[PDB]
Design a protein around this nucleic acid. Structure first.
Lengths: 98, 125, 147, 187, 62, 98, 72, 49
DNA sequence: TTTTTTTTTTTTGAGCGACTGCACTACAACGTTGTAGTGCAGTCGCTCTTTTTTTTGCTGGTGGTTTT
C-alpha cells in the first residue's frame, strides 16, 4: 500500500518473478545480460538466493557458474544463512575443487 | 508510472532521435533496434493520432526543428529579426544535436564558436 | 570459455559492500599488473608467468587489458541485494515491479505494528477461559514478537 | 599537551549548620545523599527529558503505571473498600488492558495486595499525625509524623526489600522514639 | 557517477555520437578540470575510513 | 573483536579466553537430513531438540575454526572443565557439549 | 617535541565584492494606491511588459491585475 | 621473519570474544592493569552516552 | 475581553534446578526401635550472544536568485 521495499523484499520479489511462467524467459534475458557467474561467500546463502541461482544457471549451455566458498565458515546462521543449502548445492553439483 | 516512463522516453527521443519518431509516424519500423520497439512505435503513432484528433497543435520539437532547417535552407532572402554575430563560448554551450540548425543559421548569421579542446592536433575518430 | 567476455558481462557476487569495494580494487590492481607484465613480457610472479606463457599474442591481450582498465568503472561487481534490485529495475515488465520505490532500513516498527494488529484482531474478542491460557503463554504481543 | 587536567569534584566547602533543620530535609538527604548534595547545596539538578508518547495501547503493566496501580490498590484495600469500583475506575481511564487481560491483571494484583493486606491490617490500629520538636546538638528539628498508632509505626509500600526504605524507617523510628513513643516500627 | 539504464530504452542499446551519458560527462569533466588548472591542482579524497580505519580506494581517474 | 567481525582479517597474536563457554539451544528449529528444508517444531519433542542441538554444535565448531584460523604467529586458548549442569560433583563434565 | 603555529602575515583577500547601488546605500485614485515595495515592483513590471506603441487595452490590464492579484 | 625482527606493539595482540558482556569483562580486566584497549565490534550509538 | 500561579520522587526478574531440614512409613535388628528411602517446604545460585544488505535523473534540455 505504501509502495515501500525492504532488503529481503528484493530477494522475495525476484523469487516470485522467477516463480512465474514468463519470468523464466526473464532468466533467459539474464542469460543475455551476464552469461557467467562467480559467486563469492556461498556459505552465507539464503535458500531463496540458491533457488534463484539454480533457476538461472543450472544446466543451460555457454554459461558458467563458479560457487566459491567455505562450509567451515558458515557462522551467520542467526542472520538467515544455512549450511544445509550449501550441502544441497554440494549434492546437486558434481565437480569439487579445493 | 508506465505512462511517465514512456513520456520520459518519448521526450528523450524528441530531443535526440528525430528520425526514429519521423519513421514511426509513417508506420514503419527501424531495422537493427532492440526488443522494446513493437510496443513503442504503435504507441507513438496513436499518440500522434490522438493529439491530431484533439484541439492541441501538431507541432513538437522534432518537426519544428526540421521545419526550421527547411525554412533556413530554401530561403534566399534573410528573414528580419535576426542578429549580426553570435558567440558560442564552450563545448556545453550547445549540445551536439543542434549543429544542423547551426549550419543553417551560419548561412545568414556569422557564428563564432569558441572551442576549448585540450589537444591542438586531430585526435578524433 | 568459447568466447572472450567484456567487463559488463562478468558478474561477481559478494555480500559485504566493503568486500565488493576491496575486490574491485584488487581486480583493478591485477588488471594493471597483468597489463604491465604483458607490455614488458616479463614478471616477478609465477602465476603471472604462467598466465603470460599461456597466451601467444601480446598486443591484443594488452589492448584488451587496457580496455578492461578503462571499463573497470562500469564493472558488474555488485552485492546480492544490489544485483537483485538491478534485475528488478532493469526488466520491470517481466517482474511486475514499480519504477520508483522508497527503501526502509529497519522493518521492526512495521513488524511490531502488524503483531499488534494481529493481537488486537485475535486476543480481544476471546472470553476469559481462553484469554487465561493466552496470558499464560505470553504476557503481551512483545513476548510473541520476541519469540 | 600543556594544560591542566580535570581536578577532582569533591572539595572541602565551608558550611554552617543552621539552627532549625526540618525533618523533610533529612528525609530527602537520607533518601539519596549525592542527589541531595547536588540539588540542594550547589543547586544543580540534572533535568532529564520526559518520555515520548507510545504508539500503542498498554497491553501489560510495568514500571510507574504498575506501581501507581499497586499503590492505589493497597491504599484502597487497607480501608476494606470495594475493589470492583477501583477496577471500573481504572478501566474507565484506559490504564488497564482491554477485555479479559485487564481483568486477569486486576485479579492477580488484587490477590497480591490482599495477601499483603492480610499482614498489614493484622496489627493495624487507628492513629493520627503528631508533632515532632527536638533539640539535638543545639540543632532544632521540627516536623510531623503521619499515622502514629499506639503500637508504634506502621508503613506499607508496594515495593521490594531495599535499604533506602529501611533507612527511611530507621530515621522515622529515631525521630519517633526520641520524644516518647515506646514501641516497635514495622514496614 | 554511474546510472543504470531504464531497461527498455532503445538509446541505451544503440548509442550514437551525440548521446547524453553521465559516466563520459564526468570523465570529460575531470579532464577539463585537469586542463583548466593554471598554477596549482589540489586533489583530495577519502583514503582511509574513520570508523574502522579500513583502506579506501580512490577513483579510477585519480 | 568478535568472531563474526574477525572473518577475513589478520592478527599476529590471538587470545581466546572464553572459547570453552557454550550455549544450549532450547527452541526446536532444525533442518531435515534428506530434503534439506527448514523444519520448525512448535511441540517440545526431544528429537527436534537433539537435531537442533547438532546444528548448534556444528555452528560452534565452525565458530571455533574461524576463531582459530586467524592467528599468524601465536594463538592461546582457555580450557577448563566447565559444567553447564547445576550439579557440583556428578562425576562427569560438559566439555563434550562444547 | 616543540611546536608553534604559524602566523598569517598578509590578509588573504582585499575588500572585493560585486555590489550594486543598494549595497552603497474620488474613492479610486493613484494617491489612494497602497504604497509598498511589492506594488512598486508590480508597477515597474507593468511599465516593463507593456508596449509603448500599441494602445492600452482594458482587458489586458484586467488580466494583469488578475495575474498579480490586485483588486478588479 | 627469517632474519628480520619486529617488537610486539599493543596493536598486535587481539582478544577474540563472542558476546558484548565478556568483551566488557576483558576491557575492565585490561584497564585495571593500565592497558588501554579498543573494541572494534562496538556497534553502540553515540547518542546513548 | 481581562488574566494567576507551581518546583517534590517513586519502580523495576523469574523460571530451572540444586542444598538442606523435617516429617513419614517400610522393613529388618534386638512388641519395640533404628536405619533407609521418599515428599514437601524454605532457601539459594544463575543467567539471559553474534549483524548487514541502496535506485533516486549535477544543467532531462522555452532551463537561469536577489534589485529597484
Amino acid at each position: 500500500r505504501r509502495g515501500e521495499l525492504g532488503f529481503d523484499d528484493m530477494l522475495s520479489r525476484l523469487d516470485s518473478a522467477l516463480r512465474s511462467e514468463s519470468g523464466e524467459v526473464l532468466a533467459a534475458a539474464i542469460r543475455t545480460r551476464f552469461p557467467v557467474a562467480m559467486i563469492d561467500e556461498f556459505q552465507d546463502t539464503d535458500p531463496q538466493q540458491y533457488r534463484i541461482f539454480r533457476r538461472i544457471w543450472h544446466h543451460q549451455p555457454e554459461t558458467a557458474l563458479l560457487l566459491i566458498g567455505d562450509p567451515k565458515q558458515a557462522i551467520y546462521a542467526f542472520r538467515g544463512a544455512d549450511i544445509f543449502t550449501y550441502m544441497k548445492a554440494r549434492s546437486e553439483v558434481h565437480a569439487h575443487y579445493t | 508510472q508506465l505512462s511517465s516512463k514512456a513520456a520520459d522516453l518519448f521526450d528523450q527521443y524528441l530531443v535526440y532521435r528525430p528520425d526514429w519518431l519521423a519513421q514511426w509516424e509513417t508506420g514503419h519500423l527501424v531495422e537493427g533496434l532492440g526488443e522494446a520497439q513493437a510496443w513503442q512505435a504503435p504507441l507513438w503513432k496513436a499518440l500522434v493520432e490522438y493529439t491530431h484528433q484533439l484541439g492541441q497543435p501538431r507541432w513538437h520539437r522534432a518537426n519544428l526543428y526540421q521545419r526550421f532547417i527547411e525554412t533556413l535552407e530554401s530561403a534566399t532572402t534573410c528573414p528580419p529579426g535576426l542578429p549580426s554575430r553570435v558567440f558560442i563560448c564552450g563545448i556545453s554551450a550547445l549540445p551536439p544535436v543542434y549543429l544542423q540548425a547551426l549550419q543553417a543559421l551560419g548561412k545568414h548569421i556569422e557564428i563564432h564558436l569558441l572551442f576549448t579542446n585540450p589537444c591542438r592536433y586531430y585526435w578524433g575518430d | 570459455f568459447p568466447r572472450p567476455l567484456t567487463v559488463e558481462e562478468l558478474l561477481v557476487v559478494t555480500f559485504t559492500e566493503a568486500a565488493t569495494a576491496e575486490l574491485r580494487g584488487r581486480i583493478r590492481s591485477n588488471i594493471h599488473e597483468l597489463r604491465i607484465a604483458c607490455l614488458r613480457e616479463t614478471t616477478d610472479n609465477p602465476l603471472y608467468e604462467r598466465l603470460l606463457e599461456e597466451i601467444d599474442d601480446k598486443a591484443q591481450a594488452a589492448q584488451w587489458l587496457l580496455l578492461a582498465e578503462r571499463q573497470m568503472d562500469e564493472a558488474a561487481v555488485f552485492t546480492i541485494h544490489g544485483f537483485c534490485q538491478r534485475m528488478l529495475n532493469l526488466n520491470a515488465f517481466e517482474s511486475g515491479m514499480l519504477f520508483e520505490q522508497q527503501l526502509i532500513e529497519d522493518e521492526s516498527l512495521l513488524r511490531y505494528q502488524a503483531c499488534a494488529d494481529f493481537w488486537r484482531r485475535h486476543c480481544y474478542p476471546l472470553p476469559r477461559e481462553i484469554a487465561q491460557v493466552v496470558f499464560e503463554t505470553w504476557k503481551g504481543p512483545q513476548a510473541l514478537l520476541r519469540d | 599537551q600543556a594544560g591542566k587536567a580535570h581536578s577532582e569534584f569533591v572539595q572541602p566547602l565551608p558550611f554552617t549548620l543552621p539552627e532549625t533543620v526540618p525533618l523533610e530535609t533529612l528525609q530527602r538527604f537520607w533518601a539519596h545523599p549525592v542527589r541531595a548534595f547536588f540539588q540542594m547545596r550547589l543547586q544543580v539538578n540534572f533535568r532529564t527529558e520526559d518520555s515520548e508518547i507510545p504508539d500503542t495501547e498498554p497491553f501489560i503493566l510495568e514500571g510507574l503505571s504498575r506501581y501507581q496501580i499497586n499503590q492505589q490498590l493497597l491504599n484502597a484495600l487497607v480501608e476494606q473498600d470495594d475493589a470492583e469500583r477501583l477496577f471500573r475506575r481504572f478501566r474507565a481511564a484506559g490504564d488497564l488492558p482491554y477485555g479479559a487481560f485487564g481483568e486477569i491483571f486486576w485479579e492477580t494484583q488484587c490477590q497480591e495486595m490482599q495477601q499483603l493486606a492480610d499482614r498489614v491490617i493484622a496489627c493495624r490500629q487507628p492513629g493520627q499525625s503528631m508533632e515532632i520538636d527536638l533539640a539535638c546538638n543545639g540543632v532544632q528539628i521540627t516536623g510531623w509524623l503521619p499515622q502514629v498508632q499506639p503500637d508504634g509505626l506502621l508503613r506499607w509500600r508496594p515495593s521490594l526489600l531495599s535499604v533506602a526504605q529501611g533507612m527511611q524507617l530507621w530515621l522515622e523510628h529515631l525521630v519517633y522514639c526520641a520524644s516518647g513513643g515506646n514501641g516497635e516500627s514495622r514496614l | 557517477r554511474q546510472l543504470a539504464p531504464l531497461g527498455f530504452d532503445l538509446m541505451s542499446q544503440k548509442p550514437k555520437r551525440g548521446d547524453r551519458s553521465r559516466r563520459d560527462d564526468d570523465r570529460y569533466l575531470f579532464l577539463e578540470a585537469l586542463i583548466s588548472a593554471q598554477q596549482k591542482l589540489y586533489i583530495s579524497y577519502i583514503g582511509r575510513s574513520i570508523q574502522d580505519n579500513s583502506e579506501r580506494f580512490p577513483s579510477v581517474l585519480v | 573483536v568478535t568472531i563474526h567481525k574477525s572473518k577475513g582479517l589478520e592478527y599476529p597474536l590471538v587470545w581466546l579466553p572464553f572459547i570453552t563457554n557454550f550455549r544450549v539451544q532450547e527452541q526446536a528449529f532444525y533442518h531435515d537430513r534428506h530434503s534439506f528444508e527448514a523444519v520448525l517444531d512448535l511441540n517440545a519433542a526431544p528429537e527436534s531438540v537433539d537435531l537442533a542441538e547438532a546444528e548448534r554444535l556444528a555452528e560452534d565448531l565452525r565458530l571455533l575454526y574461524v576463531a582459530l584460523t586467524r592467528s599468524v604467529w601465536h594463538c592461546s586458548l582457555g580450557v577448563a572443565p566447565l559444567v553447564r549442569r547445576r550439579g557440583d560433583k556428578k562425576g562427569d563434565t560438559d566439555v563434550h557439549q562444547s | 617535541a616543540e611546536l608553534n603555529a604559524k602566523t598569517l602575515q598578509r590578509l588573504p583577500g582585499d575588500n572585493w565584492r560585486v555590489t550594486s547601488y543598494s549595497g552603497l546605500q474620488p474613492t479610486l485614485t493613484p494617491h489612494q494606491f497602497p504604497r509598498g515595495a511589492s506594488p512598486g515592483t508590480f508597477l515597474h513590471s507593468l511599465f516593463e511588459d507593456l508596449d509603448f506603441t500599441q494602445p492600452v487595452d482594458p482587458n489586458w490590464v484586467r488580466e494583469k491585475l488578475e495575474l498579480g492579484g490586485f483588486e478588479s | 621473519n627469517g632474519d628480520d625482527a619486529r617488537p610486539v606493539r599493543a596493536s598486535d595482540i587481539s582478544v577474540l570474544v563472542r558476546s558484548r558482556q565478556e568483551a566488557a569483562q576483558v576491557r575492565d580486566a585490561l584497564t585495571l592493569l593500565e592497558i588501554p584497549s579498543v573494541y572494534l565490534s562496538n556497534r553502540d550509538s553515540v547518542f546513548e552516552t
